[PDB]
Design a binder for this molecule. Structure first.
Ligand SMILES: [Fe+3]
Ligand SMILES: [Fe+3]
Ligand SMILES: [Fe+3]
Ligand SMILES: [Fe+3]
Ligand SMILES: [Fe+3]
Ligand SMILES: [Fe+3]
Ligand SMILES: [Fe+3]
Ligand SMILES: [Fe+3]
Ligand SMILES: [Fe+3]
Ligand SMILES: [Fe+3]
Ligand SMILES: [Fe+3]
Ligand SMILES: [Fe+3]
Ligand SMILES: [Fe+3]
Ligand SMILES: [Fe+3]
Ligand SMILES: [Fe+3]
Ligand SMILES: [Fe+3]
Ligand SMILES: [Fe+3]
Ligand SMILES: [Fe+3]
Ligand SMILES: [Fe+3]
Ligand SMILES: [Fe+3]
Ligand SMILES: [Fe+3]
Ligand SMILES: [Fe+3]
Ligand SMILES: [Fe+3]
Ligand SMILES: [Fe+3]
Ligand SMILES: [Fe+3]
Ligand SMILES: [Fe+3]
Ligand SMILES: [Fe+3]
Ligand SMILES: [Fe+3]
Ligand SMILES: [Fe+3]
Ligand SMILES: [Fe+3]
Ligand SMILES: [Fe+3]
Ligand SMILES: [Fe+3]
Ligand SMILES: [Fe+3]
Ligand SMILES: [Fe+3]
Ligand SMILES: [Fe+3]
Ligand SMILES: [Fe+3]
Ligand SMILES: [Fe+3]
Ligand SMILES: [Fe+3]
Ligand SMILES: [Fe+3]
Ligand SMILES: [Fe+3]
Ligand SMILES: [Fe+3]
Ligand SMILES: [Fe+3]
Ligand SMILES: [Fe+3]
Ligand SMILES: [Fe+3]
Ligand SMILES: [Fe+3]
Ligand SMILES: [Fe+3]
Ligand SMILES: [Fe+3]
Ligand SMILES: [Fe+3]
Ligand SMILES: [Fe+3]
Ligand SMILES: [Fe+3]
Ligand SMILES: [Fe+3]
Ligand SMILES: [Fe+3]
Ligand SMILES: [Fe+3]
Ligand SMILES: [Fe+3]
Ligand SMILES: [O]
Ligand SMILES: [O]
Ligand SMILES: [O]
Ligand SMILES: [O]
Ligand SMILES: [O]
Ligand SMILES: [O]
Ligand SMILES: [O]
Ligand SMILES: [O]
Ligand SMILES: [O]
Ligand SMILES: [O]
Ligand SMILES: [O]
Ligand SMILES: [O]
Ligand SMILES: [O]
Ligand SMILES: [O]
Ligand SMILES: [O]
Ligand SMILES: [O]
Lengths: 172, 172, 172, 172
């Protein structure tokens, strides 16, 4: 590669691996998104919330593939694993799955930052910090707040709570 | 002081003391404000309500310091006492703490008015009446109304009530 | 905490401690600000300079408290220490106190960066670098330039120099 | 008088007396104003400063005469005493005369407030507080600040200082 400089084979492969993880998370969010528009679930605000996240994850993998080209790495694609569940249950369940998925992406991001730091690759480190890290922290905080409000709305009165949350917090 | 006229040493010191009280109330409101944005509390409308009050209290101390300069008093600063609690509980609790804090400021304002009246200082009296007294009365009334609506929303159904109040009364 | 990830207890406490330092610096700037509007000092441009800095420091503590919530730390408030002097002397003196105060904040910022670097927390490191470090360096440079111009205006002709500096350099 | 209510003969006469004092202060400011435009003094910014004050004093006496009509008092005019000096010296001297004149008006205002308070006439008290008291305090503060800056510009270098003050502080 005529352009490749300070770009380790380890980062390259771990970037490809993070790309597969983003593709998979996107796929998960697509499934959550359509799930909540089923006639027998019908929570459009929740559907929208998840569709948006599918879309932000695709931007993630796209930005990771562009950066691969820019550093002169070579993208390598693997199969994308189907989402972990076929039905997602109620809003609090789905939001807890989404939380767990974002924590795993965040950990993979922190892991890739540590690797790049170890291979003294400050371009890769700051690319991750300016385009991925701050955004994860903001999104996880939002999901925590959502979970707190779903819980304050739970207990016996749960169906009503789910309706109110979708109507008064989520965007439709 | 070349400008000082009809400005008693007692008013001067009591103004400095009221400044410390406003600084402390601001500090309290800052703490309430961030408290309600914790991921495990997550009531943005309540957070905003308290952040706004932190800000109005700062204007209070600023207006009191300007008036000190204008009369030719000398400001004297003391340490600012940390807020009285580290956790503020639920919306009704916090609103009751806020009520109690505004009553204490109002009493200190009325006390300073009586002192200025006693020292025949009509500039100070009307400064307090045009910039502080009317505003306290309006704010305490609002807090009373909030407390009435939180109570009408309380009982067994309390979590839901707190959610509705934050969503349908408070500004976000 | 449902959201807390890669956020050490040490950073958390040192953030709370940096918050107290910003609150205190704000307080110092408030005192400088009113001091320079005393009828017997009367340097409005210097007053304005310090009032602005009080305001930028408050933004600092506010941004630090928001980041605490976002990472899922818990804010803890302590008393705020009164400013170190009651009278600030002439413009060069005050500007030298302000310089010394900014160096201490900068050192505390660098100290917190080193700690976060030691605990491999790149979110915290870059938060500090993008919102605090560059701004300190710019502000200290400005204060150095001010001190150089106050000195070039000093010597026997000092009163006149102070007047000219306030009128021709500072904003009013 | 068909309209007169709660309006004591004492207030009435003291209002007429305060009118004479405002007429006299206006007259003083007229004299200061033209003095500073003499070819051999030639400080246009100082001239303007005093002309403006002549004008604000006339508004004072006009507002006092209107209030006399409104309460159903009867205006009584006396001769207006010529200003106390024919030459006003240098800017600091004139500004000190102006300071002394504003303190005497302020004392007469406070005296009339006390009298109205003694005769339980709250209309007269608040008329004075909303249209006269706050304005005196602001003006005396400004004059103090001017005197501080003239002094910081004084000593051996006095002619230059006077020039700079007129050019860089006063409006022209
Ligand atoms: Fe639909
Ligand atoms: Fe849809
Ligand atoms: Fe979108
Ligand atoms: Fe869309
Ligand atoms: Fe879209
Ligand atoms: Fe993004
Ligand atoms: Fe988007
Ligand atoms: Fe986007
Ligand atoms: Fe987009
Ligand atoms: Fe391109
Ligand atoms: Fe299943
Ligand atoms: Fe970095
Ligand atoms: Fe974005
Ligand atoms: Fe929030
Ligand atoms: Fe907020
Ligand atoms: Fe506001
Ligand atoms: Fe706001
Ligand atoms: Fe604001
Ligand atoms: Fe206010
Ligand atoms: Fe406000
Ligand atoms: Fe306001
Ligand atoms: Fe405001
Ligand atoms: Fe001012
Ligand atoms: Fe406690
Ligand atoms: Fe009053
Ligand atoms: Fe009044
Ligand atoms: Fe207001
Ligand atoms: Fe001023
Ligand atoms: Fe000012
Ligand atoms: Fe500003
Ligand atoms: Fe400003
Ligand atoms: Fe401002
Ligand atoms: Fe800033
Ligand atoms: Fe600013
Ligand atoms: Fe700013
Ligand atoms: Fe600002
Ligand atoms: Fe926020
Ligand atoms: Fe001292
Ligand atoms: Fe860094
Ligand atoms: Fe960086
Ligand atoms: Fe900025
Ligand atoms: Fe002229
Ligand atoms: Fe003229
Ligand atoms: Fe005019
Ligand atoms: Fe004019
Ligand atoms: Fe005019
Ligand atoms: Fe007026
Ligand atoms: Fe005018
Ligand atoms: Fe006017
Ligand atoms: Fe006018
Ligand atoms: Fe009329
Ligand atoms: Fe003479
Ligand atoms: Fe009154
Ligand atoms: Fe006016
Ligand atoms: O939809
Ligand atoms: O979207
Ligand atoms: O996006
Ligand atoms: O984004
Ligand atoms: O927020
Ligand atoms: O605000
Ligand atoms: O405000
Ligand atoms: O206000
Ligand atoms: O000011
Ligand atoms: O400002
Ligand atoms: O700011
Ligand atoms: O800033
Ligand atoms: O003039
Ligand atoms: O004027
Ligand atoms: O005026
Ligand atoms: O005025």
């Amino acid at each position: 590669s005529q352009i490749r400089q300070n770009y380790s084979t380890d980062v390259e492969a771990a970037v490809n691996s993070l790309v597969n993880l983003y593709l998979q998370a996107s796929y998960t969010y697509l499934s959550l998104g359509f799930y909540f528009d089923r006639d027998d679930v019908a929570l459009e605000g929740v559907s929208h919330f998840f569709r948006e996240l599918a879309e932000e994850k695709r931007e993630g993998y796209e930005r990771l593939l562009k950066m691969q080209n820019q550093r002169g790495g070579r993208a390598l694609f693997q199969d994308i694993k189907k989402p972990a569940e076929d039905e997602w249950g109620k809003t609090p369940d789905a939001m807890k799955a989404a939380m767990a998925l974002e924590k795993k992406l965040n950990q993979a991001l922190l892991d890739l930052h540590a690797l790049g730091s170890a291979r003294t690759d400050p371009h890769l480190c700051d690319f991750l910090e300016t385009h991925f890290l701050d955004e994860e922290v903001k999104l996880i905080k939002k999901m925590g707040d959502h979970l707190t409000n779903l819980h304050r709305l739970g207990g016996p009165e749960a169906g009503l709570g789910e309706y109110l949350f979708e109507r008064l917090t989520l965007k439709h």
